[PDB]
Amino acid sequence: ELISENMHTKLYMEGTVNGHHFKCTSEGEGKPYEGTQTCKIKVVEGGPLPFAFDILATSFSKTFINHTQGIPDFFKQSFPEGFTWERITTYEDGGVLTATQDTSLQNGCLIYNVKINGVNFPSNGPVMQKKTLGWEANTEMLYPADSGLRGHNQMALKLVGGGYLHCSLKTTYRSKKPAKNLKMPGFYFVDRKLERIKEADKETYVEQHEMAVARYCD
Structure with missing residues (x-):
């Protein structure tokens, strides 16, 4: 019941990519049961x-995923304790971006803390040359593993000049709520699309929108 129809998020992110240090903050809001949210990032x-x-x-x-068809919701169930996630994204041209994240709920607000390591991006590739055009829609698979949930996703980064760069994502989501107090889902899918609403100043301000809907085979 701590997750209401409308929720706010606040986030802190720090990391490096190819040795370049950075920090971001964001604030957002969304409708957790409808699977939609936005965030404003600096x-x-x-x-x-x-x-x-x-x-x-x-x-x-x-x-903020709309869990349909009665699929148990590992994430909404995890409160008030919250959960963590950990991920590797592998780009086919050699770059890897790993991220570790903590999700907590404090005074009605969702609080995210993220640490990023980006390594080996090719110095002349589209990421370091800023020749990318956002992500195509995608479907994550999720199932229980390693005491948490495992997710696998494949994504396509559209490129200036045509064509795509392929990535795989492998994630584990871990609840901070005791296992005995969780109803685990079985295997399922989450369909997503991530867009930008607006941006400005060489991507130092970006507003993202995400829609995420969980289902079985359709």
Whole structure:
């Protein structure tokens, strides 16, 4: 019941990418049961970034997925204790971005803390050359594993000049609520699309929108 129809999020992010240090903050809001949310992001240290902001997009909120068909909701169930997630995104041209995240609920607001390591992005590739055009829609698979949930996703980063850069994402989501107090889902899918509402100043301000809907085979 601590997750209401309308919720606010606040986030802190720090990391490096190819040795370049940066920090971001954001604030957002959404409708957790409808699977929609937005956030307004600022690069507060290290801006303008020397790499495409697209590589940070998926690191800014799992409480906002519309779990349909009665699928148990590992994320909404985890409160008040909250949960963590940890992820590797591998780009086919050699860059890797890992992220670790803590999600907590404090005074009615969702609070996110994120740490990022981006390593080995090719110095002339589209990420470091800022020749990217955002992400296509995608479907994550999720199922229980390693005492939490495992997720796998594949994504396509659209490129200036045509074509795409492929990525895989492998994630584990861990509840801070005792296992005995959780009803685990079985295997399921989450369909997503992530857009920008607006941006400005060399991607040092970006407003993202996400829609996320959980289902079985359709």
